[PDB]
């Protein structure tokens, strides 16, 4: 139609994507272990009219040739995998992570997902499931006679049997480190799954091989900056404002041309 | 007829100006984008010969160039240990998939599955900087020496040097999209230097340089462009009606 | 700097400036005040030093 209108349309779409990401970050406060997202944008084609080299005379060079360019295609959304703020929940089933790592989980399909959330539970058979009945790995079975549970900061889980005066070691809850936290594909349910961008999982006991430490009785809050997101809404709104004003200008020029 | 074509060249020039303005306003909030400005130029001149020794009628206008303003954009804080912005002149060098090299003033860096530092689209930065598999913290000093911190080892192992490249002509570079420039014969060969020496800029870690687009400038420019478009259309309509009255007889 | 004429110099050039980057969060290691918890297991430190 008009080469201005396509460019302005791409700008509007980019700002709308920006607002989408902002709203997803912003509504996902109070979601344990959530990681902030941020959108990275990227200019589209540059349609060359005069080549920047392409000497004019036998001696001159025509610096900085003419090329117009279009578009603001959003190239990616990276996820900032920084440590969240621990807060004392004082619940024995809740465990936070200090440092790198992800709890492995086996999905009902059998494929492995990875969640950085510790709001764990014990189901009717006693397993450690995670807020939706997703079994953690490797399987940890609480005996029916157990009265108290503790997760050692190194990752050892041991329960207090009835009658017995010893917190017997029932399992070892190990973390998984990825070379690329950012490349994980989120599938919702606070889960991430492997993709060849993240790299192969490296499963280790907590602490060893760069894994973090397990803090029982703590929960890892989302690392969402509220003030940053508020000003980000202001900025994205006024950018959308401006892009719509550009569309208005192109519309008005074009309708004057029709009236011509 | 004559006035019709010269006014059409005017319309085309104003449309090119609006295209540039739209691309500027749209790439706001793109890290490291350099705003573009269109420089116009008038076309050849017809010389009516007088039997001063003549007069010139002139014909239209022509967009002769677009310069990019290679100033320093405002920094924005991102809390990301990989993002890097540049204080002053210089470009990051990246290696295109085919094997040649482009240059980007955009520091939203990531690490791929093998630990290589890539740029939001997968192009390998140069020189090859590969993070160790068990990294805790990545630091990039102002001098470009990127290092990591391992587990318990209380000493940063130097893992790379993130050089910059400076050009004799910043504006001569042609952009190939995806926030990438490639050297042209108008730009001269790249001068590969460490940050902070020999004219290149410093590096700020955890900050990304924003676009140097001034939106107030662009809104006033759009006012000018729309009014100029309407004015040239008025001239076109005038010539059209004159041709009415000419052919009526 | 940036002399305009041959003789003028333009003191105090125009530069805008940005940002309030927090360079550090320094942690002050001063001595705390000791109080009798009267528990056998709780030992305090007086002066420099840390427990390994």
């Amino acid at each position: 139609m008009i080469s201005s209108l396509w460019i302005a349309k791409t700008g509007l779409d980019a700002q709308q994507t920006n607002m989408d990401v902002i709203a997803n970050n912003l509504a996902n406060v109070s979601t344990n272990g959530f990681k902030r997202q941020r959108a990275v944008f990227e200019d589209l084609l540059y349609q060359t009219i005069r080549q920047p080299g392409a000497q004019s005379s036998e001696q001159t060079t025509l610096p900085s040739g003419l090329q117009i360019g279009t578009g603001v295609r959003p190239v990616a959304t990276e996820r900032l995998h920084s440590q969240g703020n621990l807060s004392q929940t004082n619940n024995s089933k809740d465990v936070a992570i200090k440092g790198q790592g992800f709890f492995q989980v086996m999905l009902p399909d059998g494929t492995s997902a990875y969640t950085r959330d510790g709001s764990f539970q014990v189901d009717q058979n006693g397993q450690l499931v995670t807020a939706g009945g997703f079994q953690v790995q490797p399987a940890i079975t609480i005996p029916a006679n157990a009265l108290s549970i503790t997760i050692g900061r190194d990752g050892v889980v041991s329960v207090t049997q009835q009658g017995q005066a010893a917190p017997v070691q029932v399992g070892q809850l190990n973390l998984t480190t990825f070379m690329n936290d950012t490349g994980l594909e989120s599938i919702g349910e606070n889960l991430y799954i492997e993709t060849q961008s993240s790299g192969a999982p490296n499963e280790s006991t907590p602490g060893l091989n760069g894994a973090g430490l397990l803090y029982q009785g703590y929960v890892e809050t989302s690392n969402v900056n509220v003030a940053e997101e508020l000003v980000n809404m202001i900025q994205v709104q006024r950018a959308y404002e401006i892009n719509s004003k550009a569309v208005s200008t192109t519309d008005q020029m074009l309708q004057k041309l029709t009236q011509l | 007829i004559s006035s019709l074509w010269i006014a059409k060249t005017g319309l085309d020039a104003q449309q090119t100006n609006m295209d540039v303005i739209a691309n500027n306003l749209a790439n706001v909030s793109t890290n490291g984008f350099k705003r573009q400005r269109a420089v116009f130029e008038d076309l050849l001149y017809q010389t009516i010969r007088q039997p001063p020794s003549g007069l010139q009628i002139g014909t239209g206008v022509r967009p002769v160039a677009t310069e990019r303003l290679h100033s320093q954009g405002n920094l924005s804080q991102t809390n990301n240990s990989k993002d890097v912005a540049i204080k002053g002149q210089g470009f990051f060098q990246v290696m295109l998939p085919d094997g040649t090299s482009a240059y980007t003033r955009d520091g939203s860096f990531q690490v791929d599955q093998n630990g290589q530092l890539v740029t939001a689209g997968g192009f390998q930065v140069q020189p090859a900087i590969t993070i160790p598999a068990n990294a805790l913290s990545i630091t990039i000093g102002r001098d470009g020496v990127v290092s990591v911190t391992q587990q318990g080892q209380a000493a940063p192992v130097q893992v790379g040097q993130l050089n910059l490249t400076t050009f004799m002509n910043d504006t001569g570079l042609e952009s190939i999209g995806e926030n990438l420039y490639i050297e042209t014969q108008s730009s001269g060969a790249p001068n590969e230097s460490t940050p902070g020496l020999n004219g290149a800029g410093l590096l700020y870690q955890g900050y990304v340089e924003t676009s140097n687009v001034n939106v107030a400038e662009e809104l006033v420019n759009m006012i000018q462009v729309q009014r100029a478009y309407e004015i040239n259309s008025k001239a076109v309509s005038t010539t059209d009606q004159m041709l009415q009255k000419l052919t009526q007889l | 700097g940036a002399q305009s004429s041959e003789q003028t110099t333009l003191p105090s050039g125009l530069q805008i400036g940005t940002g309030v980057r927090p360079v550090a969060t320094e942690r002050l290691h001063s001595q705390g005040n000791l109080s009798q918890t009267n528990n056998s297991k709780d030992v305090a430190i007086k002066g420099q030093g840390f427990f390994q």
Partner: protein, 42 residues
């Protein structure tokens, strides 16, 4: 067919030799010493 083309002598035999070395020059494109510790050590 010649005897040499389809037969080998008992005493005549080849052996395999292996060694480690370094290559200089290369106009860049060399090993990443960060990921190749043995190169820097050698």
């Amino acid at each position: 067919e010649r005897i040499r083309d389809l037969t080998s002598v008992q005493g005549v035999r080849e052996n395999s030799l292996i060694g480690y070395g370094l290559v200089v020059g290369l106009d860049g494109t060399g090993d990443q010493t960060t990921q190749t510790p043995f190169t820097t050590q050698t």
